[PDB]
Amino acid sequence: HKIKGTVVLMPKNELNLNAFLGRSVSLQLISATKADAHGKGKVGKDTFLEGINTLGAGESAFNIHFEWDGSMGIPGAFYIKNYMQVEFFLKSLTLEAGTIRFVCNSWVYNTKLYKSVRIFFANHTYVPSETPAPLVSYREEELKSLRGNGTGERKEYDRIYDYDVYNDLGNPDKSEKLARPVLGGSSTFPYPRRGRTGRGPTVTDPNTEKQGEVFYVPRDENLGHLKSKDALEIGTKSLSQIVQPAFESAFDLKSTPIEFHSFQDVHDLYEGGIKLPRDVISTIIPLPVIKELYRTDGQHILKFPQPHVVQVSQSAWMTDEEFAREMIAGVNPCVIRGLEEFPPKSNLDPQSSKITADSLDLDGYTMDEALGSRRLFMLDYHDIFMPYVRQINQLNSAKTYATRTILFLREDGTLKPVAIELSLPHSAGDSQVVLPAKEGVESTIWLLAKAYVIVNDSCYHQLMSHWLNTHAAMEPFVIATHRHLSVLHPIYKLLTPHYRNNMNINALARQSLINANGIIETTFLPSKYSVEMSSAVYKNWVFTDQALPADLIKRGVAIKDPSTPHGVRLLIEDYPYAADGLEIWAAIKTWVQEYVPLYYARDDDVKNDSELQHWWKEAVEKGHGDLKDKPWWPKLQTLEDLVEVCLIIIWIASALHAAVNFGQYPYGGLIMNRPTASRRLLPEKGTPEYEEMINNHEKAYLRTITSKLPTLISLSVIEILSRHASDEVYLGQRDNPHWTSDSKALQAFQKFGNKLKEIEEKLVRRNNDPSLQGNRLGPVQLPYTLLYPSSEEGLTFRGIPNSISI
Numbered sequence: 001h002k003i004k005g006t007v008v009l010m011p012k013n014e015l016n017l018n019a020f021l022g023r024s025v026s027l028q029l030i031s032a033t034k035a036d037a038h039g040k041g042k043v044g045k046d047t048f049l050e051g052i053n054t055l056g057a058g059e060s061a062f063n064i065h066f067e068w069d070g071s072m073g074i075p076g077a078f079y080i081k082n083y084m085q086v087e088f089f090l091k092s093l094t095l096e097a098g099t100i101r102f103v104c105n106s107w108v109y110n111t112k113l114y115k116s117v118r119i120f121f122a123n124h125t126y127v128p129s130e131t132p133a134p135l136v137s138y139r140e141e142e143l144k145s146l147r148g149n150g151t152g153e154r155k156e157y158d159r160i161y162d163y164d165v166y167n168d169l170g171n172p173d174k175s176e177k178l179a180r181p182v183l184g185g186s187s188t189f190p191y192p193r194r195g196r197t198g199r200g201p202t203v204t205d206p207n208t209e210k211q212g213e214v215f216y217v218p219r220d221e222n223l224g225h226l227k228s229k230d231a232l233e234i235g236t237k238s239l240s241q242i243v244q245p246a247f248e249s250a251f252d253l254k255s256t257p258i259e260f261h262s263f264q265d266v267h268d269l270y271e272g273g274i275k276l277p278r279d280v281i282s283t284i285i286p287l288p289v290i291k292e293l294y295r296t297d298g299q300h301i302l303k304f305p306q307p308h309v310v311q312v313s314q315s316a317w318m319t320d321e322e323f324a325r326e327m328i329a330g331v332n333p334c335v336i337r338g339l340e341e342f343p344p345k346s347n348l349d350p351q352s353s354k355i356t357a358d359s360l361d362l363d364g365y366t367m368d369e370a371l372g373s374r375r376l377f378m379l380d381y382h383d384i385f386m387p388y389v390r391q392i393n394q395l396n397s398a399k400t401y402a403t404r405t406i407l408f409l410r411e412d413g414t415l416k417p418v419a420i421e422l423s424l425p426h427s428a429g430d431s432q433v434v435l436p437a438k439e440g441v442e443s444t445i446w447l448l449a450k451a452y453v454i455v456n457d458s459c460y461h462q463l464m465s466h467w468l469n470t471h472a473a474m475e476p477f478v479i480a481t482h483r484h485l486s487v488l489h490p491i492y493k494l495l496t497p498h499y500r501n502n503m504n505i506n507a508l509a510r511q512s513l514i515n516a517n518g519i520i521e522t523t524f525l526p527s528k529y530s531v532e533m534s535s536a537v538y539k540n541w542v543f544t545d546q547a548l549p550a551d552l553i554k555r556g557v558a559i560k561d562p563s564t565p566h567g568v569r570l571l572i573e574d575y576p577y578a579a580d581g582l583e584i585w586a587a588i589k590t591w592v593q594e595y596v597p598l599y600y601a602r603d604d605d606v607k608n609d610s611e612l613q614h615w616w617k618e619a620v621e622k623g624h625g626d627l628k629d630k631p632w633w634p635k636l637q638t639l640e641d642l643v644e645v646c647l648i649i650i651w652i653a654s655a656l657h658a659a660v661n662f663g664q665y666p667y668g669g670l671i672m673n674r675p676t677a678s679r680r681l682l683p684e685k686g687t688p689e690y691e692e693m694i695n696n697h698e699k700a701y702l703r704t705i706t707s708k709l710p711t712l713i714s715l716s717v718i719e720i721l722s723r724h725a726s727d728e729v730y731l732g733q734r735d736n737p738h739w740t741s742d743s744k745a746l747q748a749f750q751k752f753g754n755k756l757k758e759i760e761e762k763l764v765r766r767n768n769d770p771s772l773q774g775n776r777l778g779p780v781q782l783p784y785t786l787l788y789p790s791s792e793e794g795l796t797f798r799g800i801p802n803s804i805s806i
C-alpha cells in the first residue's frame, strides 16, 4: 500500500533540520511501466518529508511514504518541489523493497524559480531505443530544458548548457588597452567554444561580453564542498583580485627588495620565508584557500612550501641531465620530437637552423649514426614563437628568443642536451647557437641559454599543453554531453564523471586566469598575447592526435609495432611519461572496450542512437566548430568509432591532464628551474651587464628571468593548481557506488579499479628499479609519480583525477 523511502540531502550551509518537515518539500513518484492517455508515465500524489532518520558528511536522511498501488506499477523517476526559501543539495532517493535507487546530486531551488518541475530518474541505464515508453517524453523533455533558448543572461539556478566564443576576456569598457581579440568564430582566431553566459555586450564593443561579478556555470557544475579549503578553484579569483594587489602594495612601500639578489634569496622563500607588511599578512590569513598555500608567523613572515625538485639537492636543477630529463619526465613531458635530418628545418616562410653537425658532441656517434639509430631529438619552439617574438619584445620588461634545443639519446638511455639555438626575427625592421659548457663565462651563457628555452617551454606548457589541450579542448564535450545525452544514457554515465569541476574551474579561469591583466598575462612572458598564441596553436589541434599512441608516433618518439604490448615501440625506452602513460591508456582502453558492447551490439546500434549522433554532431560542428571541416574527425557510425571517441575523451580529462598539471609546483616552485618569463636578451660584450654576467652569474640569471613580484604571484597560482582537494574523485572511482543498476557495468568497472592498482604497483617497481634511476629520478632524485593513479590530498606529485578539476 505504502512504499518506504529515504531522502538524503545537504542543507546549503554544509556546502534546523525540522524546517525541512511539514509542507516544505514534496516528492511525486513517476511510473516507468504504467502510462496515462498520452503514454506518459503516471504521477503519484504530492508526498512530503515525514521525519529525520537517526551516512557521513553534512548529510541528513528523511523518511517518506508513498501511496503506490498496483495501478501505478513500477517507479522509475520522480518530481521534487522545494517550497522552502533556500536551495538544498539533493543526494538521493532510496525506495525499499529489488530496492530502487535514485542518484541525484543536484541543487534544488525554490519551486517558483523553475519553469519545469525538477525531475530525477532511477539509476537504470538505457540507450534511446531502450527507454521505458512512459519515460520517453520525460527524457527528451529534460534534454530540451537543458539546452535552453540560446538567449538571455544565465542565472545562478539555471541548468542551461550552451556555447559561446571567448569574447569575455578583454575589458575594453575599462580601458581600450584591455581590449583582446575574440578567440573563436573565425579562421584568424579559431578556438574551442566555452559555456555561454549571456551577460550581453560591453558599451564600447558589441562583440565583447560585459564583465560580471560571477561567471555563470550551469548550477550542478558548481560543486560545493564540505570543507571550504577544498574549493581550490576559488583561490584563483582571490589571488588576482585580493592577494596580488596586496603583494604589489608591499613592493611600492619599499617593504621588501624589488628584485632577488642571489639564488639564496629564492631558497629563503621556502626556508625562513619572506618579510611582508602587516596589512599584507592580515589580508591573506582569512582567505580559506589562499591560507593553505603558506605558513605564517602571524604578523610579517610568509613561507612557501619546499618544492619537490629541491628536496634532495638544492642545485641539481642546474645540471644538463635534469634540464634534459624534465622534457620526458617533467611538468611538460609531451613536446619533444624526433629529429630525422640535420640541420633542423622550419615550416615558416622567411628560417633554417644554423646549428652545425660538426659542433655537436654525440658521445662519439657520428651525425649519420645518430640519425640512423634515431637518437637525435629536439625541443622545437622556433616556428611557434617566431611569429610573436617581435611583438613580445616590443612589450616592456619582456625579451625572448624563438628557441630550438637539440637532444641526443645517450647509450645509457638518458637525454643529453647538445645545442640550443636562439633566434630573433630576420625582417630588417630590427640568431645564435649556444653549446654546452661546464666552466667559464661559456657555462653562464649556456645556463642563460637554458633559461630562455624553459621560458619558451613554460609558456607553451601553461597555455598549450595544459590550458588549450585540456581545459579548453574538453569544455565543448561537457556542454554537448549535457545537451544531448540523457542522464539515463550509458555514454553520459561513462563520460560525465570525467567532466567533474571542469566548466567551473574554466569559468573562474576566464574571470581571473586568462583574462586581460589576469594572472597569466601579468606573470608569463607573452603578456597580452598569451591567450591568442594558444589560438594559433589550436589551428593545428587534431582530436585523434590526442590519443597517446597517435601522439607518440606523430612526434617521432615511438614507431607503430604490433609485436609490442601496446602496439608501439618507444624510441626512448625509459621515457617515463610515455612508458607510464601507455599503461594508463591501455587500462582505460580495456574498460571502454568492455563497457560499450554492453549497450551496443553492432555498428547499426551506434548509427541508430539519435542521442549519440546529435551529441557528436553538435560537439564537432558547434563545440569545436572552427575545425568542423577537418577530415580527421571520427564519423561515429561504428562501434570502433564510439570506443575511440570515448577513450580519447577519458584520456585527456584524466591522465593527460594529471601528468601536465600536478608537476607545476613540484618542478616550478623554484623559479630558476621553470622561469615563466625572460626580461632581457643575452648581454653583448663591452656592456655593464656583460661584466655582471662574468662577475655574478646568479644576479645575471635572476635579472634575466621572472621578476621577484610576479614570481610571488606565479608561485602562488601553480601551488593552488598543484593541490588535490580532499574530496577529489580519482580514476577508477565513482562518487556513488550505485551510479548504475547494471550489474555488468558495475563488475566491469570494478575490474578497471583493480587493474589501476596493479599498474600502480608496477610504477612503484619502475621507480625503485636502480637501472632506471637516470630518467625516473635523475639528479634531483625525484621519483616520477605523476601517473600513479592514487593519491591523498594536498601537494602530492601523484594521483590521477577523473576530470580536469583544477
Ligand SMILES: [Fe+2]
Residues within 6 Å of the ligand: 466, 471, 657, 661, 721, 804, 805, 806
Ligand atoms: Fe589544470
